Amino acid sequence: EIVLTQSPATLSLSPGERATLSCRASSSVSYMHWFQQKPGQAPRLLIYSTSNLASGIPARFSGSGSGTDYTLTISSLEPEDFAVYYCQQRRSFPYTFGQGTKLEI
Amino acid sequence: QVQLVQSGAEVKKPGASVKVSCKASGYTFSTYWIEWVRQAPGQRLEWMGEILPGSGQTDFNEKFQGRVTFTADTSSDTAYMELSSLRSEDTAVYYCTRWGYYGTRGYFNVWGQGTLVTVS
Amino acid sequence: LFPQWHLPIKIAAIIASLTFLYTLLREVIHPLATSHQQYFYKIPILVINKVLPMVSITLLALVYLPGVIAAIVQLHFPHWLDKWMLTRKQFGLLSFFFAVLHAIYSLSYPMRRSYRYKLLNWAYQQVQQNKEDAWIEHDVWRMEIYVSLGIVGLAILALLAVTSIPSVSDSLTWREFHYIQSKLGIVSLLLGTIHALIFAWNKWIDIKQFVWYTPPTFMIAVFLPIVVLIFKSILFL
Amino acid sequence: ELFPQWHLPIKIAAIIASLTFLYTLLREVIHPLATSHQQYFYKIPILVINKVLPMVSITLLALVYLPGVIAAIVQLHNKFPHWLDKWMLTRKQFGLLSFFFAVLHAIYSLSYPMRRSYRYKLLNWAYQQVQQNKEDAWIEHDVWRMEIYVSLGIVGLAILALLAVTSIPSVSDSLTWREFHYIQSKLGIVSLLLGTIHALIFAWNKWIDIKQFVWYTPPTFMIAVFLPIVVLIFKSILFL
Amino acid sequence: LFPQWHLPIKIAAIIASLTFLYTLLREVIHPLATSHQQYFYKIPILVINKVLPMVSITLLALVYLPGVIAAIVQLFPHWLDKWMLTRKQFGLLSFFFAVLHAIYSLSYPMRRSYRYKLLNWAYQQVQQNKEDAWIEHDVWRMEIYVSLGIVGLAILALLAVTSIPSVSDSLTWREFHYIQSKLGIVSLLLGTIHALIFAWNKWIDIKQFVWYTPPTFMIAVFLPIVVLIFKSILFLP
Ligand SMILES: CCCCCCCC/C=C/CCCCCCCC(=O)O[C@H](COC(=O)CCCCCCCCCCCCCCC)COP(=O)([O-])OCC[N+](C)(C)C
Ligand SMILES: CCCCCCCC/C=C\CCCCCCCC(=O)O[C@H](COC(=O)CCCCCCCCCCCCCCC)COP(=O)([O-])OCC[N+](C)(C)C
Ligand SMILES: CCCCCCCC/C=C\CCCCCCCC(=O)O[C@H](COC(=O)CCCCCCCCCCCCCCC)COP(=O)([O-])OCC[N+](C)(C)C
Ligand code: HEM
Ligand code: HEM
Ligand code: HEM
């Protein structure tokens, strides 16, 4: 199977700066999907195809990358974006998820 | 409005078996795939399996091949997952998930509320 | 009149019709009885393309079947044996005709509208489930292995049929004629049998092939040629 | 000096081809360019050419059997002149040319899905279907039509191939008169009927369409089957 | 026996083996050695179909080569005569291989590897939000060389039909010479033009050399071009 690794373990980042998350893969993957999860709730789809925002998602979030280097960028950190973020690939038969990246204050 | 409803929390003992249900309302239940995913405390999400209701086509994970099974009832619009030989590491939360696409709008993904299974 | 063509043609009828009513019993009537589905558009081409290959390969086996019997009885002649042995040319010509028809029918599959509609439906279904790769491994090998074998067998049959023109056949010393008529025909029969065997990849162990109690047609088609080839191999070695 | 008996059949066919070419080029290339300017110049090598071979083949096939129909009528209803004799003698060449053009037409028709235009059109159709949230593209009557006329054309080509194989001089000088007459007459009439039915079935519902008249001119399939229908009708009338 | 069918078969076998080894080295081993990719499914069809056209066109060019040499030296040794007495066999083998190449080429859109690629392309086009996928020069190329190849095959078929012994006895010397010379030269010209048109813009491409070796279509059209050029020079000095 394909193993997905997220570089930053945690981000004790100021409430208002920019955030950069990375989801490095280990094999050729065309597209990458980004989800977010808050405690007590199921994961919520955030970005699909690395460049498309889901319906109702604000314009703060953005995505980029190709090959095996995928990046999620947050422009402004309002007091609502403190959660866990996951990355998923849908090329290989076993759809592997990421390990998560907690973001704190 | 598409929705998926699952059963309640379950507590078991090692060596027993567990059954979980997911009922989908809002579309044609016998056309689109349903995926079963598992999340354990302090661990990454784990993709268990996939089923196509209304026909015989079921995809398994290599690790779970031989313990878990998926069944479908079209009349009641329900999908059941049965797991056997429960161990101490099988306590988790199980979700039933479905993807979809809409023209000029994009992709959407729907998850269940999650069923908690514990063993002691 | 054609007095010498009276017997083989009759046989070509009995093999044909009995196949037709068989296929119609497994691809049309059965889906209608259980899980009601029309499936009435397969008769013009799909059903017909399951009758031509069976008649072509059954008549080819009957050419070399008296040959094995003649050797056995000599080690261990009636009128029926001579009547059988005087129709091998007609049997081979009919086999070549039906093989050409089967090849022409098979070559025209992708140009129909049903294939286009199925392709569009498959693309829509694949887009609606977020699956990037639909590629598979063993099916490509399966379908790329036996097409070439069938083409080579058809080429060998065509060469051996070209050899049978009366003007051409008087320029040989009967040794080249015997070689071409025997060895090339045996090789063509073996190639056709192998092509048919490779066509059925893993359906041999499948249980859904038996609709009610009937076996599929590819099991019946390759019964006699296997026996003929086994007997020829025993006699040669 | 070279091929004296093949001069007339080749002189008649070529003209027909010309009379078809400038026709098709006038209906599928010049007209779309004149109104709603669109350059369909890539259809000349294959699409335009494939509308010329079947017409020539079927016309030669009809011309093979017209002289016999004329002769029977002139015998019944009230010696023959020179033109009738030439028509009675050129039949073999007419039939051989018809078979050659039929084989060429079949070979051209068998290779439509190979070209890249089909792939591009399929991709565009799939994208348009996806963007409009349409689930089923199935149509029944068009599939029925396709299957029927494809099968009929294949059977007709097989019959023509058999009747052309039976014309080798070494093969020909091995059969009695009755068998040769049977093969040359009955199989040929059956092949002509099968080709006419194939052409008729190809046009499913375009007979009642008004768009088919591009300016004032009838489509090609109307002219393609005018003579075979007359020949078959006269043969049926003399049969009864 | 076939005492007159030995040298053409030996030459065809040598050419086929060399072409097969060359194509297998170029199209399979190199992608495996660097940037490891399997690509082992191309052997049965995609590799075999790169050998038959080269054998068919090389034997056709060898039919008219002795005629050019005889005119040059005139303006016969043993080698020239033994070359001149094998032209009919060379032409028959060339026709056989041309028909085989056409039949393999006609069955590309039927295999499953085409369907999977089509589905993947459709999914990718949907994902990239690309509305139009039309390209003009590729379509023009495809139409042109397909039509030219079909016409050349038809001319070869007529020329080979003319070779039946019972048919060649009803034609005088002038007609036989005309058919055997002019139509054959026209067919060779059509085949080489087909091969030239097939390579649209790969003549000025650098990645066509796997290590240092030119592609197949460059080698395949060397002898026919020389033969046609010398015929043109000998026609108008
Ligand atoms: C379009 C679909 C249909 C195609 C049709 C094809 C079928 C072609 C024909 C098939 C055989 C049909 C025989 C019909 C019998 C009438 C003839 C006859 O009586 O004489 C026959 C001889 O003559 C022959 O049999 C020679 C066979 C010629 C075949 C051409 C090979 C070219 C390969 C094409 C490449 C195809 C590539 C295709 C790739 C896709 C019988 O002999 P006889 O003279 O009577 O005297 C003997 C006396 N006895 C012993 C009989 C008593
Ligand atoms: C798709 C498009 C389809 C178009 C079809 C077009 C159909 C074409 C129509 C008809 C084909 C007719 C071919 C007749 C040529 C034979 C002439 C002859 O008598 O030579 C004989 C050769 O003896 C032999 O038997 C050798 C066999 C020759 C066959 C090779 C070419 C056949 C093509 C196969 C088709 C491939 C099918 C592949 C199917 C997968 C004589 O022996 P020789 O000693 O060598 O010569 C000197 C002897 N004499 C005469 C001087 C005394
Ligand atoms: C789809 C796959 C299936 C296809 C199956 C194909 C297999 C077909 C099987 C066999 C091929 C048919 C062979 C027919 C033999 C010709 C008859 C004959 O003897 O002519 C002679 C002259 O000879 C000639 O003039 C040259 C022959 C030109 C005829 C062209 C017909 C098409 C040829 C290729 C067909 C395919 C085209 C391929 C195109 C790609 C007659 O001349 P004549 O003196 O005026 O008449 C009196 C003759 N005597 C009595 C005096 C002796
Ligand atoms: C160019 C030549 C040929 C091609 C392209 C070809 C292709 C095919 C195809 C596509 C099928 C699948 C049929 C289906 O799915 O219903 C098939 C099956 C078959 N073929 Fe052919 N074939 C060729 C020649 C031959 C020859 C020469 C023979 C025998 C001598 C033969 C015997 C068979 C048989 C027995 C089957 C089994 C079909 C069944 O049992 O349903 N084929 N071939
Ligand atoms: C394997 C054999 C054959 C095949 C696969 C075949 C297939 C086709 C196809 C695809 C078309 C549509 C042409 C287009 O859309 O431009 C067509 C039309 C036609 N065919 Fe056939 N055909 C075969 C044999 C024949 C024969 C033997 C004849 C006549 C003797 C014939 C006569 C016609 C005619 C007259 C048309 C209509 C021409 C027009 O509309 O301008 N076909 N056929
Ligand atoms: C109906 C007849 C024919 C068709 C449909 C046809 C089709 C094709 C196709 C599809 C290719 C591409 C090969 C590839 O992509 O690997 C090709 C190439 C080629 N063809 Fe044909 N062809 C026909 C007849 C002929 C004839 C009669 C000749 C020569 C006498 C010929 C000589 C060649 C050559 C030399 C190539 C170059 C292939 C290479 O260099 O790899 N073809 N043709």
The pairs formed by E68-77 with CB atoms below 8 angstroms and a separation of 24 or more are: E68/E227, E68/E230, E68/E231, E68/E234, E71/E234, E72/E230, E72/E234
Chains A and D touch (3+ CB pairs under 8 A): no
The amino acid occupying position E187 is: S
Ligand 6 center from residue E41 Cα (angstroms): 21
CA distance D2 to E181: 15
**CA pair distance E42, C186, nearest whole angstrom:** 29
Residue C221 CB less than 6 A away from ligand 4: yes
The answer to whether A45 contacts B106, with C-beta atoms less than 8 Å apart, is no
CA C161 to centroid of ligand 2, rounded, Å = 10
Residues in chain A: 105
Instruction: Give Cα C226 distance to the centre of its chain.
Output: 13
Question: Using CA atoms, how far apart are residues A63 and B17, in angstroms rounded to an integer?
Answer: 43
Strand intervals (E) in A1-105: 5-6, 10-12, 19-24, 33-37, 44-48, 52-53, 61-65, 70-74, 84-88, 101-104
Superfamily of domain B3-119: Immunoglobulins (2.60.40.10)
Chain D: residue whose CA lies nearest to B103: D131
Which residues from chain D sit within 8 angstroms of residue C104, using beta carbons?
154, 157-158
Nearest to D46 by CA among D94, D148, D116: D116
Resolution (A): 3.0
Domain count, chain A: 1
In the numeric block, the tokens 């859109």 are attached to E109
Cα separation, A34 vs D148, in Å, equals 52
Which residues form the pocket of ligand 1, taking CB atoms under 6 Å from any ligand atom? C 4, 89, 93, 96-97, 100-101, 103-104, 158, 161-162, 164-166; D 157-158, 161-162, 165-166, 171, 174-175
**Smallest CA separation from ligand 4 atom 32, residue:** C53
* DSSP-derived pairing of the beta strands B10-12 and A52-53: unpaired
Residue-wise burial string across A62-89, b where 16 or more C-beta atoms lie within 10 A, e elsewhere: ebebeebebbbebeebeeebebbbbbbb
* Cβ C64 vs Cβ C181: under 8 Å: no
Distances (CA, A) of D212 to C84, D47, D217, D222, E61: 58, 17, 8, 11, 48
Give the atom of ligand 5 at the shortest distance from the alpha carbon of C104: 1
Identity of the amino acid at C165: I
**C36 touches C230 (CB < 8 A):** no
- The minimum-distance atom of ligand 5 relative to the CA of D203 is 40
Could you tell me the distance, in angstroms and rounded to a whole number, from the CA of residue C90 to the centre of ligand 2?
20
CB atoms within 10 A of CB C92: 23
Gap from A96 CA to chain C (nearest CA, Å): 14
Contact between D146 and C112 using a beta-carbon 8 Å cutoff: yes
* CA–centroid distance for B105 within its chain: 27
* CA–CA gap between residue E3 and residue E105 (Å, rounded): 33
State the Cα–Cα distance between residues C15 and D89, nearest whole angstrom. 42
CATH of the domain at A39: 2.60.40.10
Angle at A93 between CA A88 and CA A96, to 5 degrees: 30
SS (H, E, C) chain D: CCCHHHHHHHHHHHHHHHHHHHHHHHHHCHHHHHCCCCCCHHHHHHHHHHHCHHHHHHHHHHHHHHHHHHHHHHHHCCCCCHHHHHHHHCHHHHHHHHHHHHHHHHHHHCCCCCCHHHHHHHHHHHHHHHHCCCCCCCCHHHHHHHHHHHHHHHHHHHHHHHHHHCCCHHHHCCCCHHHHHHHHHHHHHHHHHHHHHHHHHHCCCCCCCCCCCCCCCCCHHHHHCHHHHHHHHHHHHHHC
Using the atom order of ligand 3, give the atom closest to the CA of residue E157: 38
Residue E172's SS3 state is coil
CA dist., res. B21 & res. B5, Å (int): 8
Side-chain half-sphere exposure of C55, counting CA atoms within 13 A: 29
- Tell me, using a 6 A CB cutoff, whether residue E167 lines ligand 3: yes
Q: Are C22 and C217 in contact (CB under 8 A)?
A: yes
Instruction: Please report, as a single letter, which amino acid is at residue C32.
Output: L
Cα distance between the two ends of chain A: 35
Q: Are B81 and B36 in contact (CB under 8 A)?
A: yes
d(CA B30, CA B110): 17
Q: How far is the centre of ligand 2, averaged over its atoms, from the C-alpha of C167 (Å)?
A: 12
In which domain, by residue range, is A74 found? 5-104
Confirm or reject: Cβ of D162 under 6 Å from ligand 3: no
For residue E91 and ligand 6, the question of a CB distance below 6 A is answered with no
With CB atoms and an 8 Å threshold, state whether B45 touches A97. Answer: yes
Name the binding residues of E for FAD.
Answer: 74, 87, 163, 180
Question: Do D147 and C41 lie within an 8 Å CB cutoff?
Answer: yes
DSSP at A94: S
Question: For atom 41 of ligand 6, which residue has the closest CA?
Answer: E50
Give the integer Cα–Cα distance in Å for E138 and D115. 9
Q: How far apart are CA D58 and CA D36, in angstroms?
A: 34
Amino acid at C96: F
Neighbours of D147 (CB within 10 A): 21
Q: Which residue, among E99, E64, E75, has the nearest Cα to E181 in the 3D structure?
A: E64
Distance CA A89, CA A99 (A): 13
**Closest-lying ligand 4 atom to the alpha carbon of residue C217:** 40
The Cα diameter of chain A in Å comes to 39
Round to whole Å and give the CA distance between C116 and B87: 50
| Contact between residue D196 and residue C19 where contact means Cβ atoms under 8 Å apart | no
Longest dimension (CA), chain C: 72
3-class DSSP assignment, residue C28: coil
Reduced to 3 states, what is the DSSP secondary structure of residue C80?
Answer: helix
Tell me the two tokens of residue D137.
């593209």
Which residue has the CA at smallest separation from atom 25 of ligand 4?
Answer: C150
Q: Hey, what are E124's tokens?
A: 């990718």
Task: Please provide the size of chain E in residues.
Answer: 237
Q: Which of C82, C60, C5, C48 is nearest to C189 (CA)?
A: C60
A48 touches chain B (CB under 8 A): yes
Q: How far is it, in rounded angstroms, from Cα E47 to Cα E104? A: 11
- Altogether, the residues listed in chain C come to a count of 237
Would you give the DSSP letter of residue C37?
Answer: -
Angle in degrees, 0-180, between the axes of helices E7-24 and E52-74, rounded to the nearest 10:
130
Ligand sitting nearest the alpha carbon of C162: 1
Nearest residue on chain B to D129, judged by CA atoms? B103
What residue has token string 């093989």?
Answer: C99
Chains with at least 3 CB pairs less than 8 angstroms from chain A:
B, C, E
Tell which residue, A18, A34, A41, A40, has the closest CA to residue A103: A18
Amino acid C23 reads: T
Query: Residues B69, C125, D144, CA angle at the centre, nearest 5°?
Result: 120
Residue that the structure tokens 């070695």 belong to? C237
> How many Cβ atoms are within 10 Å of E211's Cβ, its own excluded?
7
Strand partners, B58: B51
CA C203 to chain centre: 17
SS3 of residue C61 by DSSP: helix
Q: Which amino acid is at C153?
A: G
Closest listed residue to residue B79, CA positions, set B7, B2, B8: B7
Instruction: Give Cβ neighbours of residue D53 (< 8 Å, ≥ 6 apart).
Output: D101, D102, D104, D105, D108
Euclidean distance between CA atoms D136 and C128, whole angstroms = 13
**A44-48 and A19-24 strand pairing:** unpaired
Cβ-Cβ contacts under 8 Å for D136 (sequence gap 6 or more): C121
Which of C100, C104, C105, C164 has the most ligand 1 atoms within 8 A of CB, as the residue to mutate? C100
Nearest partner of A85 among A40, A30, A46, judged by Cα: A46
Return all residues near E131 (Cβ < 8 A) that are at least 6 apart: D127
Q: Is E26 in the pocket of ligand 6 (CB under 6 A)?
A: no
Q: List phi, psi (to 5°) of C106.
A: -70, -30
Q: Which is nearest to A63 in space by CA: A82, A76, A49, A77?
A: A49
3-state DSSP of chain B:
CCEEEECCCEEECCCCEEEEEEEEECCCCCCCCEEEEEECCCCCEEEEEEECCCCCCEEECCCCECCEEEEEECCCCEEEEEEECCCCCCCEEEEEEEEEEECCCEEEEEECCCEEEEEC
Chain D residues whose CB is inside 8 A of the C123 CB are 126, 129-130
Q: Is residue E198 lining ligand 6, measured as CB closer than 6 Å?
A: yes
- The token pair that represents D44 in the structure block: 């000349």
Method: cryo-EM
Distance in Å, CA E92 to ligand 2 centroid: 6
Closest CA to E173 of E181, E183, E184: E181
Is any Cβ of chain A less than 8 angstroms from the Cβ of C137?
no
State the burial class of residue B8 (Cβ atoms within 10 Å of its Cβ: 0-12, 13-18, 19+): exposed
Say yes or no: E129 contacts chain A, CB-CB below 8 A: no
Residue with tokens 């003009």: E136
* Residue E105, SS3 per DSSP: helix
Residues 6+ apart with CB under 8 A from E49: E101, E104, E105
Within a 10 A sphere around the Cβ of E6, how many other Cβ atoms?
A: 12
Name the token pair of E47: 């590799």
Q: Cα dihedral angle (D150, D154, D160, D166), rounded to 10 degrees?
A: 180
Spell out the domain ranges in chain B. Answer: 3-119
Give the gap in angstroms from C-alpha C127 to the nearest C-alpha of chain B. 8
- Verify whether the Cβ–Cβ distance D132 to B103 is below 8 Å: yes
Distance (Å, whole) CA D25 – CA D196: 24
Residue nearest to atom 42 of ligand 5 (CA): D153
Neighbour count for residue A28 (Cβ, 10 Å): 9
- CB-based contact C107 E110, cutoff 8 Å: yes
Locus of tokens 């490509």? C140
Contact C132, A91 (CB under 8 A): yes
Secondary structure of residue C230 in the 3-state scheme? helix
All residues at 6 or more sequence positions from C232 whose CB lies less than 8 Å from its CB, including other chains: C64, C68, C186
